[PDB]
Every structure is written in structure tokens, then in C-alpha cells.
Structure 1
Amino acid sequence: PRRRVIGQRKILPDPKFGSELLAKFVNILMVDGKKSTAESIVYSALETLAQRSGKSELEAFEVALENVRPTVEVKSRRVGGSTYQVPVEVRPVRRNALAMRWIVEAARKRGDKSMALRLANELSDAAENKGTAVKKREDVHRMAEANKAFA
């Protein structure tokens, strides 16, 4: 951080689908190294999402991700010893990472049944713009618009 840099950590793509976004989703939502316990959750969620949406891969994940991925966000960039937040332009690589974290947090909330169902409902809501995950995006947009004075 202070001096050095990193190329990246290469990730093995998804087993069932020819993609890596879903593998990173599994990595984000697993816990205690229980990848074999997160895999069933994610695949069950994408099973019960396709039947309600009408498509298997795009409408399952991407359309619920592009309604929750952020565009700008606030960071502390004081100059003269103050504390006001300065909005910044988020980068394309971090957009998906932020979106998936927000979706997984919204799905960890909303406690009704198994996580394989909580995530499915939260993702349908994300695809329609109806969840807490998209509410977080709207709130951060409000903050950035309000602090748009500093640039």
C-alpha cells in the first residue's frame, strides 16, 4: 500500500456456468471457509430465481446487479482540519464488488426462511428495484448529490 502493488488474485471460475462473477459472489457470501455450504445456497437461489424471472443467467444476476451497483460515493478528503465528506467517482472494478456486498448484506437481513430463499427474494427485489440493497444505492447517491459542492 505505502509503496508496493499487486497484480491480482486469480479466481477459479464458476463450476456450472462459464463465469467468474458468480464465483466471486460465492466467495463473498461464504463464511468460515464453508464453500460447499455456500454453493448449495447460491445454486438454489439461482434455481428459484429463473422460474420467477424467465431467464437463467443474465436476468438472474446481471439485471439485479446493475440496479444496485453504485456510481459515486463519499470519502473523507479534509484539507484544513475539517471532516466534511468529498464524493468520489467509483471505479468499474469496485462497482460489482460493492454491489455484491450490499446484496449479500440485504439478504443476510430479511429473515424469513433458509438463506437460499432469502437471497432469491432479495435478488428479485433488486431486479425490480424493491429491496434494501437498492435503497442503500439511492441513499449514497443522495449523500453524493448533497455534497456535490466539493469537487
Structure 2
Amino acid sequence: PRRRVIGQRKILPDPKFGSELLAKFVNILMVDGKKSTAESIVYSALETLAQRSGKSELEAFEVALENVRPTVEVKSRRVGGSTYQVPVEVRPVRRNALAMRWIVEAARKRGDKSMALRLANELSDAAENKGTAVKKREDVHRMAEANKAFA
């Protein structure tokens, strides 16, 4: 907004593991204010992922995230007659959220049956550096690279 920046509101960590990032992820996943279901889904996926990849639940989730975080994004300035995309370094708070949102969109898109299972597959892909979220991440990077001249 124009006038005042405001402090971000408080977020509680999730009951199972006691973490803020996961709570944010479940929030992102949720729909229609239905939290209990969304967090159950998140837990189910997590369990499947842990089974697949070994490591802790959390650690695996974090790894998967790392593989879809963007260093740089682009924004439209357009000072000229035609529009110019300008890269910008994306801040720590934002990048994490973007990766989450990206994972969740991929899960929505996938063709598997259960939501939790789809999310799980998406996380596995991110860990392996395939899937959908990684592609979109790549595309973002690629656009930035193309418009690197602008800075």
C-alpha cells in the first residue's frame, strides 16, 4: 500500500512437528477455510515421502523445497513503448512461499487420484529434480536470464 508498511501476522507451528514452514504450507494447501483436512493431507503426503526417500519427514520436505526455490524472478516495468521484463532478486520470505505455492499448483494439476498422493509425488519429483514445480522454476530463471540486460 501507499502509506504504511505493516508487520506480518503471527503464525503457529504445526502440532505434529512443531514448525512454521509446514504450517504455512498447510495454510497454502487449504481451501474454504478447511484446515483439519488440508493438514491431514499434508501429513499423509509427508509420511509417504518419508517412506520413499528415507530421511526425516521434515528434512525431505525441506530438500524438495530447496529444489524449487527461485533465486530471481521478473517484474514488468514497461517504461518504454513496449514492455520490459526486469529481473529482481527475490527475498527469503517470498521465495519460500513461491516454492510452496508452486508445489501446490503442481499437485492440483497432476493426474493421480488422491490429493495427498499427488502432493507426495510432486515432492518426490522436486527432490529428484523433475516434476512440474521444477520446470516452472526453470522457466522463471530462464526468463530472468534472457532479460539480464535490464538491471
CA contact (8 A) 2:72 2:88 kept: yes
Provide the alpha-carbon RMSD of the alignment: 1.0
Offset of residue 107 of structure 1: 0.6
CA contact (8 A) 2:49 2:57 kept: no
Partner of 1:90: 90
Q: Deviations over 1:50-104 (max 9, x none)?
A: 0111112343211000100101011011223431211111111101000000000
Q: Deviations over 1:14-66 (max 9, x none)?
A: 10112110000000010000001101100100111101111123432110001
User: Which one is further off, 26-35 or 84-93?
Assistant: 84-93
CA contact (8 A) 2:108 2:115 kept: yes
Unaligned 5+ runs, structure 1: none
Partner of 1:145: 145
**Which 4+ stretches in 1 moved above 4 angstroms?**
none
Partner of 1:26: 26
TM-score (norm 1): 0.96
Mapped to 1, the partners of 2:12 and 2:92 lie a distance apart of 21
CA contact (8 A) 2:47 2:57 kept: no
Mapped to 2, the partners of 1:93 and 1:80 lie a distance apart of 31
Unaligned 5+ runs, structure 2: none
- Aligned pair count reads 151
Partner of 1:41: 41
CA contact (8 A) 2:49 2:120 kept: yes
Of all paired residues, the percent bearing the same amino acid is 100
CA contact (8 A) 2:106 2:133 kept: yes
Question: For 1:75, what is the secondary structure of its paired residue?
Answer: strand
